Amino acid sequence: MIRLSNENTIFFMDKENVPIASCQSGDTVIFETKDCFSDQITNEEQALTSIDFNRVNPATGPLYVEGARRGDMLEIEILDIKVGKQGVMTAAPGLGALGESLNSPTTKLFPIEGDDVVYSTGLRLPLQPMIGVIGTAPPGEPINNGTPGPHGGNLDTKDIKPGTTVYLPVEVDGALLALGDLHAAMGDGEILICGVEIAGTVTLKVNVKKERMFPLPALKTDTHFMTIASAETLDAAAVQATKNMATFLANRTALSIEEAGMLLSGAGDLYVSQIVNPLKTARFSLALHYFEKLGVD
Template sequence: MSTSLPIIIPKEQVILKFSPSNPPVQVIKSGSTITFETCDCFSNLIQKEDQLFSSVGWDKINPATGPLFVEGAEPGDVLKVEILKINIADQGVMTAAPKFGVFGDLLEEEKTKVFRIKDGKVLFNERIQIPVRPMIGVIGTAPANEEIPTGTPGQHGGNMDCKRIVEGATLYLPVHVPGALLSMGDLHAVMGDGEVLICGLEIPGEVTIRVSAIKDKILPLPMLREGDHLMAIASAETVDLAAKQATIQMHSFLTNELGMEFNEAAMLLSLVGDLRICQVVDPLMTVRMELPLSVLEDYHYKLV
């Protein structure tokens, strides 16, 4: 009886821009399973507390492992990414730096903190232990005709820093080029909505996914299913604009996929839809609109 070896993309195979010209480092068939090894957002260059954010060059920030070429994925398809497993290291780092994040104008000096993880909890200080909830900060496909830095979110996905992109979630991304060219990185052991400092608990790890090309389906992308919610994710120059865009994307799903009338869909979102901030520290702000999956069940709608 023959057994196939797991397919792994090593952490040394990284990009710093999502681009249609990036050569794929691995090719798999639609429906296959693969593991991405990932560095942290500092390329694993900060290991001690005397190593500061400024010591890491911008050519080393937010590396994303990949890209992966998915056979059969063509422009116009939807790429379905099922997150099967996230493994993380036993320590992570955070940095604070002037001019970055919500506190950037208040910070006077850089600081790095290394946090150990034990028994599934971050040892924050002698009093506080925080349960880990590993998530993927950067995950996306190549845009059609441009290069987008891995630190910037957008319609292609990218640095969305959405804390609901966790083990067990399913993320739907656009396919703009043959093969989709999927890349990911920037894992966090845990992160709050907003990522207000400039980072979560940055940590290396491994992500195992099953990836499939979905034909003849139009969804407002990126879209995420996790727990009891379906989420439309949007990024824009301001939180206000991102919130409006995410809401309109979910509204279009209700009208186009469930067949709801315009005003009815708007009323429903005002009653059961929840706007949540993903992050406010990247070049674009990211917001998600959450809809209870029970609405889909009421309409006997099955998401692909």
């Protein structure tokens, strides 16, 4: 019902951004988004370097969630993501995990045809819509949308998709939730620099939780719970994400930290979100089955 337009967009997660809309806890809110190029790239002979880089990574927002105060967390249920008709990718030498291996700058447009993302005649990828950039305002200095952090931001986590609940911190009153950078498809790592970048519309439900039960950001799918951390190195983000899960498990259950460690090492999985942003992002994942067996919800 409450609908946030793609003209109402920000480039930094900033506590001083004026809210574009407000909602109550439990309200459903629709966010319309531009692609991460602010829809500047519309043909395949248009180079990445041709656009205004001041307008990359627009996030729709911020939303003021009434009842949210410093120390709370948002529980955000992703009910649906609808994408547009065509996505974009850019390959640029010197960018991304293959930067030194790429030879020429390439722009590719991807028709969305049903639930297929058309790479070429013979290659069609599954339509797997996700949110790349989702976040609340940090309490101190503004952080550009292109950088991830404890507040969220540029997480590029493929599990931030329909049916997932995302958990973010409330560090300023009202939270100031903003999102953008939808993808039609993207693998773990986002190794080129980008997913199939695309505009769309996200429907979410936003709940205010008055107790912050675990380290943030975090998310829950139909089957698994995941702690997320970002750092300068993948080495450091992986360790932090893992420690986030173990200390949570230890704190909230009859398990000792050593027992929690054994559980994670035997039954949990460390995953890579993206290795290409100014901070790298990893998530540690444990089946909800185990949390229920340890009496945790």
